[PDB]
Symmetry: D2
Subunit: 89 residues, 4 copies
């Protein structure tokens, strides 16, 4: 995220997830039911996906859309993400 | 896909999928075992995913990287597919 | 799918997919815009997933839930399906 | 997870996720480049997915396969998980 507001809202998502992952680690140590564990992991998966989507859009918008850039510059930028994107599906 | 070669290899992938979807429809009519159908379905999901990844990459290369475009042009192009990408994950 | 009710609803999904894929093949043959093509491929991927889901739930219910089975019988049936679930 | 080995290996996955998320939280606080962050976020998505996968397989084996259960018991257990599978 380039702009402060983007940085801000991504950090907010990450701290939420950290909290979920901490709650999940507690439940494993404390021997909480298998069902609950499965549910918590599903919540973490959903939130990680959601974070990935927002972050992909921010990155593309910041590096491929904005700025009086050249196609050569944007090609390098696209290549850096290409591996990430293939994996995303 | 803009270039003829890109159009060609996507059409090639789609025809492959058509073949699978045709075979699967056959297996359903023919009362073939459930496991096989589940498998054939899994292969179609797999090829559909792979087709998506590749097309996303081609589209991003053709509309966001290539061409002496303005940031305004790229924003319209990015918005046209923003929804697809969110949906893609 | 075992039951007629589950068998109709799966075929209906496939024929729907068939149609989308033929339309997609048509748009590629006719040289239509990238955007249109991207959008249909995305609709086909989505329909592929929905179908995978409906079919997984059917298979689990038919082979793991229904029937007075032994854990051994269910272990075999589960194993043939497990790798698929991992990929999904 | 029921067995100690399935319990250890899931905890090990969660702790590694914990680590990645704290590392990610760190890069954001410190103002590191966009690309690094996208990459770390992508590794966490990947790890979340793998964990979901492993846990689904563990849950299905422990509650649908193992144990002299009735189809009625398995139906209740299956329904509790069905939604999760669809979204997955």
């Amino acid at each position: 995220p380039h702009s402060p507001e983007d940085k801000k809202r991504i950090l907010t998502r990450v701290r939420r997830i950290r909290g979920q992952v901490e709650a999940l680690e507690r439940a494993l140590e404390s021997g909480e039911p298998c069902l609950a564990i499965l549910q918590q992991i599903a919540a973490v998966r959903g939130a990680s996906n959601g974070l990935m989507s927002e972050m992909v859009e921010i990155h593309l918008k910041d590096h491929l859309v904005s700025g009086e850039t050249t196609p050569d510059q944007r090609a390098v930028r696209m290549a850096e993400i290409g591996h990430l994107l293939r994996a995303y599906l």
